Amino acid sequence: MYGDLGNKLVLEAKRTKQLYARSNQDVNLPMYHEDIIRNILKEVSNLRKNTEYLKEQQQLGMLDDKVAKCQYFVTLLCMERNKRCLLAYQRLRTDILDSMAWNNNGLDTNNLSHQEQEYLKEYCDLITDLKSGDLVDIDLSGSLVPPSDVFIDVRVLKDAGEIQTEYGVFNLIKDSQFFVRQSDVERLIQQGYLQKI
């Protein structure tokens, strides 16, 4: 029946939402199901051809006020259902992409559809526009854990040599440990070079 592929697609949606929700990290989302989506879009085209065929044969008009009305209603509702299933899948994966944009890129690519790849590019461009115009005094993409401490100890987890900061340097020697202002190192904790807190 015309709705079954929609159920299979949104079961895929439910499983990938759980795959994202259960883990503490941002898990890189799974492959875009082009095959099931092609099957559903083909089903939509079948339903469109059915409506065209019926609306042509309404000029012959077989009990049309009830029978053709009912046939048209059912084949229209099948298309509404399949639109809902497709949009549910795409809106979920869109939400995950937006979450990933804020969590990383505002500071696995094969799995996206090419529309989703260019969508993500545009949404990252939008985020970087927000933290560039007005309100730029706040890095709007920064952390949402409240600042617990102004100075922290941080252990260098990967080597990165001598780099500057606003009035000094760090030499990121492997398994050296700093005691430093948190606001000067947060970028490197997010990039995974520094360990603690």
Partner: protein, 171 residues
């Protein structure tokens, strides 16, 4: 909401429909496009379709027969022991579907019974959500009997308790 996945799946469940007319062409619902559906054909249809054919038709094209998940057998089992009941086996979306059915036909008895069911199970759900390790098999055998709706409430609640316990006792 429109994009709410657990709503989309709940709309995908099936209910027993009795047809009120002979309609040509709809036989694909009986797996054969070449024939009519007759009056008094009794057929399981998805709720997203059955909801509309139950209202449009004057007599509608379909009448919805009482589904077995709301039969007097299930209602009696609900009214004895809410926390012992395996709603996940009865239907994985029973609360969403009961809300939809209560809305589709104004049924005060079902609304009262489902309110009692949810409230009494909410007590036990909170007990298992609040309990924390320093997980119990009693919790596991209870969580198997939860709907997707109740599983979402439990996950959110238990995360709240766990996060609070973490913040209190850890740094």
């Amino acid at each position: 909401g429109y994009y709410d996945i657990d709503d989309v799946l709940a709309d995908g469940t099936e209910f027993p429909c009795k047809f009120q007319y002979d309609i040509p062409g709809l036989g694909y619902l009986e797996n054969n496009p070449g024939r009519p559906i007759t009056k008094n054909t009794k057929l399981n249809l998805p709720l997203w379709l059955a909801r509309i054919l139950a209202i449009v038709g004057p007599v509608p094209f379909v009448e919805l027969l009482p589904p077995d998940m709301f039969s007097t057998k299930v209602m009696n089992a609900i009214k004895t022991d809410p926390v012992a009941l395996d709603l996940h086996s009865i239907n994985s979306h029973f609360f969403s579907l009961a809300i939809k059915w209560i809305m589709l036909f104004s049924e005060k008895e079902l609304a009262n019974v489902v309110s009692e069911l949810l409230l009494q199970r909410a007590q036990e759900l909170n007990h298992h959500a609040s309990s924390l390790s320093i997980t119990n098999i009693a919790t596991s055998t209870f969580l198997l009997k939860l709907e997707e709706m109740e599983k979402e409430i439990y996950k959110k609640s238990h995360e709240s308790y766990k996060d609070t316990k973490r913040w209190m006792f850890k740094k």
